[PDB]
Write a protein that binds this ligand. Structure first.
Ligand SMILES: O=C(NCCCC[C@H](NC(=O)c1cccc(O)c1O)C(=O)O)c1cccc(O)c1O
Ligand SMILES: [Fe+3]
Length: 288
C-alpha cells in the first residue's frame, strides 16, 4: 500500500495517498472523520474542536466525547447530504469508504488513512504522523507513538513462545478464521503470538471453518471477534462455541477463549493513539 506523502506548500500541503492527490489546507477547522481510529487520534492530539462530523451510527463507547458532533451517518451508510451541508475543509476515510471516494472528494479534499494489513505499524505511524503534520504536532505524535512501542515491548515480553493462537470471527452461526497479515493480524504480527496456522488465506470477512477445524488445530488461545454485536443479531459466540469439540481444546480447558471487544477489533480503531494502546493491553492481559 502506497503511504501518505506530503509536500509543504505554504498555507496548504500537497498530499498523495493510495487513492489520489489532494491540496489540504494547514490546520483544517471543519473535519469530517469516518475512520474511528483516526477520530481517537484527534482526541489524543487535542484536536476535538477541529471535528465537525462523525459516524454517530457506529460511535463506540470509548468515543462518546464526540456524541454531539453532527452525524454523517455510519461507516457503511455515509450520509452525503449531511456531509455536504457541513461544508468541511477535510474528509478523512479508511477502507470502508474507498467506494465513496469520488463522491466525497467532490465535496472536499479526502484523505485516506487505511491500515496496511501486511505492514501494520508502518501504516499506523504514517497515518498518525500525517495528521499530526497538518497541525504542526509532529513532536507530540512522535512521543505518543514512542509510548505505543513501549507498550508493545512490555506485551511481547510476556508472550509464551510455545503456545499458539487461533483468531475467529463469528457471524450469524458461522465461524471464520484469520491469520497473520489479516485485519486482526496484529495479534500474530506485532505482538508475536504464534499462530496455529501461519498459512491462513487473507480475505476481508475470512476463511470459513467449523468446530472440527478448531479441535484439529487445538489452539492454546482462541481470540474471538463477535461481529453479531456490531451488526445486532441474537446469537453469541459463547453459545456457538459451547460444543464438545471446542470443549476439548486446550483453550477451552484453560478458559483462554477470549472475547475481544468488537468495537475496537471489528470497527478497526487501530489508528487511534489510545484505542491501539487499549487493544495491546487487552491481548497482553489475556495471555500474561
Ligand atoms: O467494504 C466493506 N464492506 C462492504 C460489504 C459489507 C456489507 C454488510 N456490512 C455491514 O452491514 C457492516 C456494517 C458496519 C460495519 C461493517 O464492517 C459492515 O461490514 C454486510 O453485512 O455484509 C468493508 C471494507 C473493510 C472492512 C470491512 O469490515 C468492510 O465491511
Ligand atoms: Fe465489514
Amino acid at each position: 500500500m502506497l503511504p501518505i506523502s506530503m509536500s509543504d506548500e505554504g498555507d496548504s500541503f500537497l498530499v498523495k495517498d493510495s487513492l489520489g492527490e489532494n491540496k489540504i489546507p494547514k490546520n483544517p477547522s471543519k473535519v469530517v472523520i469516518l475512520d474511528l481510529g483516526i477520530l481517537d487520534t484527534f482526541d489524543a492530539l487535542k484536536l476535538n474542536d477541529k471535528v465537525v462530523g462523525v459516524p454517530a451510527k457506529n460511535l463506540p463507547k470509548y468515543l462518546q466525547q464526540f456524541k454531539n458532533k453532527p452525524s454523517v451517518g455510519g461507516v457503511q451508510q455515509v450520509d452525503f447530504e449531511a456531509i455536504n451541508a457541513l461544508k468541511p475543509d477535510l474528509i478523512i476515510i479508511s477502507g470502508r469508504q474507498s467506494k465513496f471516494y469520488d463522491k466525497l472528494k467532490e465535496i472536499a479534499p479526502t484523505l485516506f488513512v487505511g491500515l496496511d494489513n501486511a505492514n501494520f505499524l508502518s501504516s499506523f505511524e504514517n497515518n498518525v504522523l500525517s495528521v499530526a503534520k497538518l497541525y504542526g504536532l509532529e513532536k507530540e505524535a512522535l512521543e505518543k507513538i514512542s509510548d505505543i512501542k513501549n507498550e508493545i515491548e512490555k506485551a511481547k515480553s510476556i508472550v509464551d513462545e510455545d503456545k499458539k493462537a487461533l483468531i475467529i470471527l463469528t457471524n450469524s452461526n458461522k465461524i471464520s478464521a484469520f491469520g497473520p497479515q489479516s485485519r486482526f493480524g496484529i495479534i500474530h504480527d506485532v505482538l508475536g503470538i504464534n499462530a496455529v496456522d501461519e498459512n491462513i488465506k487473507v480475505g476481508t470477512h475470512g476463511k470459513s471453518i467449523n468446530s472440527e477445524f478448531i479441535l484439529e488445530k487445538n489452539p492454546d488461545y482462541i481470540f474471538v471477534v463477535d461481529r453479531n454485536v456490531i451488526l445486532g443479531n441474537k446469537e453469541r459466540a459463547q453459545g456457538i462455541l459451547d460444543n464438545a469439540l471446542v470443549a476439548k481444546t486446550k483453550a477451552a480447558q484453560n478458559k483462554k477463549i477470549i472475547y475481544l471487544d468488537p468495537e475496537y477489533w471489528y470497527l478497526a480503531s487501530g489508528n487511534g493513539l489510545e484505542s491501539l494502546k487499549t487493544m495491546i493491553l487487552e491481548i497482553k492481559n489475556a495471555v500474561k
